[PDB]
Design a protein around this ligand. Sequence first.
Ligand code: CA
Ligand code: CA
Ligand code: CA
Ligand code: CL
Ligand code: ZN
Ligand code: ZN
Lengths: 165, 175
Amino acid sequence: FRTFPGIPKWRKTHLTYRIVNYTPDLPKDAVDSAVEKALKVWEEVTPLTFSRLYEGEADIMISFAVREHGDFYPFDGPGNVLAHAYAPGPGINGDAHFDDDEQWTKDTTGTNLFLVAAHEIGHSLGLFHSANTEALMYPLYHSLTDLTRFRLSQDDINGIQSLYG
Amino acid sequence: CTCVPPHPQTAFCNSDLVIRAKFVGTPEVNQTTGYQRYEIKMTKMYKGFQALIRFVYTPASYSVCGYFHRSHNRSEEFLIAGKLQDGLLHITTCSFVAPWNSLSLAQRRGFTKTYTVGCEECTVFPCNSIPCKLQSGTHCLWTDQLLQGLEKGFQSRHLACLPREPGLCTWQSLR
Ligand SMILES: [Ca+2]
Ligand SMILES: [Ca+2]
Ligand SMILES: [Ca+2]
Ligand SMILES: [Cl-]
Ligand SMILES: [Zn+2]
Ligand SMILES: [Zn+2]
């Protein structure tokens, strides 16, 4: 690092991700589709590119879990916290955890996996929460009337561009 | 961290502690636990009498639902609805923490008197979408967000999910 205090960012443009486990809420193909669409959201605005691993340890480990699951921050059952993630770095850093006590959906009926995943991947790329209620990095879940017109807000774009270009 | 914030009644009925307090000073982070804590001067307690409260604990970072106090006024009273874990008061980003004066009078009557009436039997069910599914007569469907209301929505600011009779809760005025 050349700057101190450091920039919460990956020191590399190309990152790896692995969907270690899956939720029973959806077909596994729907889980992958939601995840790679959530990664595309950030890919088309930044130099970042993502490769999917199926074994080993990847930069961004995506896991579904309920309540206690091996980190400092246990989930709280249905409701409230739907997911959390970690800033870039080694080990648990960069990983995204999704509370499976929620019911994840491909559409906006229940809790849309793609919407939450795109937010948490934002955290895994180094982004903080936004005060703009329209921004994806807004912490509170906002279900959309139709995912057809989901747009990355300018605040999210500028934040991820100031990190990666 | 993505949150479905609770209705003030749900926050009161699911929280072990509900207090009014002033946040004094900056937070202290400990990376061994992964948690920070804020020193607080409790001024009034509505719930959690068994725990007698000088500190409130929350995750260290935004991404794992840490609560970050944005107010700079040290005298500002805040309603805190939190959970007792290892005798320590814990809150998150989802937790109902709001300036006491910013609450509606109905919300203040709820925390002080009325919300406890609906805790035993009623349930505020959050509606992510329309059509919303009602799972039992003791559920009140919270539709503030689908009307773009959020925290300030009419149901959160003026209504409580209260029982009308055994097996039936509906939204009810708080005044
Ligand atoms: Ca949860
Ligand atoms: Ca990692
Ligand atoms: Ca589930
Ligand atoms: Cl640098
Ligand atoms: Zn976790
Ligand atoms: Zn978040």
